[PDB]
Amino acid sequence: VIREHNKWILKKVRHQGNLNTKKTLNPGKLSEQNIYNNQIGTIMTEAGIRLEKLPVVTDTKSFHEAIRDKIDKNENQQSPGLHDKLLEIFHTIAQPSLRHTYSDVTWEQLEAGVNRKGAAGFLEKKNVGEVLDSEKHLVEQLIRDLKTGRKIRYYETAIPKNPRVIQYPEAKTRLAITKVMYNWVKQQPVVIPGYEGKTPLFNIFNKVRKEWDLFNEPVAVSFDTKNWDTQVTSRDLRLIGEIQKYYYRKEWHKFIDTITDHMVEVPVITADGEVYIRNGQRGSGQPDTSAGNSMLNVLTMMYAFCESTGVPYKSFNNRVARIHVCGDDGFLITEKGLGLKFANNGMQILHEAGKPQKITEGERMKVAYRFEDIEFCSHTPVPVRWSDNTSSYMAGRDTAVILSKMATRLGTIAYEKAVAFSFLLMYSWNPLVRRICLLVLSQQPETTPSTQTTYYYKGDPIGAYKDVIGKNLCELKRTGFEKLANLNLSLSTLGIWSKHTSKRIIQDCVTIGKEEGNWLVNADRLISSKTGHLYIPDKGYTLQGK
């Protein structure tokens, strides 16, 4: 049968199991009740770009397939005592100066870190914003109920991408959990080794380069687990709860134990009313998804690494191996001899540990021999050279995608100048993107940018850039030749740009800058050379939006 506190959902099954699981229980069914950034897409169109040609990503029958294909399974078998060992590894990275110190935060602190558009659970009424509007007392009640150990009616709703299965708990539950688990879930004091989730994209690789240079013969080994979420075990969850109890005040240990207990066996209700009982996995909607998977991925990799090379997990201090993670994505840097050893012995160990890596030839983990080749968070390092001849790194992506995300912002100008600024902060190493951004930022100087995106500025935009990058945009003289070119291959292979888009976009800039004055487009070293005019910027600061 099901666990006692889970039977409340059976008393609601109005129909017969229409799904077709063979391993997870399917009690039955219940009753059931993309735009363009005009100014940005325009500059792009005018430039000779073909918006239709750019890459972009429901079916109540294709969805039910995903469930049966990935979620319908037994818990991974895990080597006995594996969790005792992992917890043993956690003690080698625990921070004593924060032990038993975390607690809950105020609504004020929380409302500055939540999406008011958060979906409403299945059987639920309001959405995140609507609950904050008139139901905070109900969430506070949930908190006190969980804090004392009172089980609740926990369940998650399953929905397709907008065919990956997204599983999340009620908006009232995501609020109770986030309110108390805030600091860990949002990692304010980052306590997970190598977690880069809260690291600005424009800073990440200059940081990994510093590490890469402390090694004699540097090598990077990447983590390539498959459908990690489905590989999370009940015992994996118990572990993470124990770690959370290391950091939280004892007054919150019962809340953690309780909530973790609900997570070990979860009642899921598909958007089309189908009901199944998931057995120990990870639902992407869970507030602890990011931090929970990150710590669990680091512990598991540290374990696998030491178990492969012979290094004592007792204490490979550091400079022996540096690990960087973001959920399940991640890699590890180390000396060539040990990296190839981990590359050779890693998989079998990870497999026995319950985190099966994706199939590979000779069953080896992928290894990067050149820094430029590392892959992380959907990005890769791009080398840049400044006017004073110093070098540095920035985050590179395939330009085709950069263009896509930059136009289809699923729209005021005070908003499009913030999207442009944000992108100018992440991709000024790409002259196509860099210029599009300068053009969008040239219109309506009287309009202060929006605060609804990742980043936005205060004052002069170009001034704000110098603020976080450390140099003026005009000092950026060169981008890695082979790297830039490769990331631009897709624009030519998908016929997204014309053999004149590059020149056109430039003449559009020079035309604006040719006229005397202090025009924003003269911040781009090239345009400024062709116009003979410079852009003298003023005060400017970079702030976060969202």
What residue segments make up the domains of the chain, in order of their start?
A: 1-34+55-192+227-309, 35-54+378-545, 193-226+310-377
Contact (Cβ atoms closer than 8 angstroms) between residue 438 and residue 520: yes
The residues, ordered by sequence, that sit 6+ positions from 540 with a Cβ below 8 Å of its Cβ are 457, 458, 459, 460, 461, 462, 463, 464, 465, 466, 467
According to the annotation, is 21 in a ligand binding site? no
Q: What angle do CA 141, 260, 90 make, to 5 degrees?
A: 125
Backbone angles phi, psi at 358, to 5 degrees: -65, 140
Residue 56's alpha-carbon distances to 131, 273, 319, in angstroms, are 33, 29, 41
The CATH code belonging to domain 193-226+310-377 is 3.30.70.270
Question: Which resolution in angstroms does this entry have?
Answer: 2.6
Give the residues across from 457 on adjacent strands: 542
Q: Give the C-alpha separation, 75 to 82, whole Å.
A: 15
Backbone angles phi, psi at 42, to 5 degrees: -70, -50
DSSP class per residue in 286-298: STTHHHHHHHHHH
β strands within 120-164, DSSP E? 156-160
To the nearest 10 degrees (0 to 180), the angle between helices 38-47 and 413-427 is 60
Give the tokens for residue 319.
């400079």
Give the residues across from 334 on adjacent strands: 219, 321
Q: Which of 326, 245, 227, 330 is nearest to 282 (CA)?
A: 227
Backbone angles phi, psi at 109, to 5 degrees: -65, -35
According to the annotation, is 126 in a ligand binding site? no
How distant is the alpha carbon of residue 377 from its chain centre?
7
Give the tokens for residue 145.
């109920």
Give the tokens for residue 509.
């800039």
According to the annotation, is 405 in a ligand binding site? yes
User: What is the number of other CB atoms lying within 10 angstroms of the CB of residue 367?
Assistant: 17
Torsional class of 35: left (φ above 0), alpha (ψ -120 to 50), beta (otherwise): beta
Give the tokens for residue 338.
């040990």
Q: Give the C-alpha separation, 229 to 289, whole Å.
A: 9
Residue with tokens 């950034």: 37
According to the annotation, is 201 in a ligand binding site? yes
Experimental method: X-ray
Residue with tokens 């395939």: 398
Residue 286's alpha-carbon distances to 123, 155, 192, 241, 372, in angstroms, are 17, 11, 18, 14, 34
Name the residue type at position 325.
Answer: V
Q: What angle do CA 97, 103, 107 make, to 5 degrees?
A: 135
The residues, ordered by sequence, that sit 6+ positions from 480 with a Cβ below 8 Å of its Cβ are 372, 382, 383, 384
Q: Which helix (H) or strand (E) holds 260?
A: helix 253-263
Q: In this structure, what DSSP letter does residue 450 have?
A: P
The residues, ordered by sequence, that sit 6+ positions from 326 with a Cβ below 8 Å of its Cβ are 195, 196, 197, 294, 376, 377
Give the residues across from 223 on adjacent strands: 330
DSSP class per residue in 406-430: HH-----HHHHHHHHHHHHHHHTTS
Residue with tokens 């750019």: 54
Give the residues across from 195 on adjacent strands: 325
Q: Give the C-alpha separation, 161 to 460, whole Å.
A: 38
Q: In this structure, what DSSP letter does residue 117 have?
A: T
Q: Give the C-alpha separation, 430 to 383, whole Å.
A: 11
How distant is the alpha carbon of residue 106 from its chain centre?
25
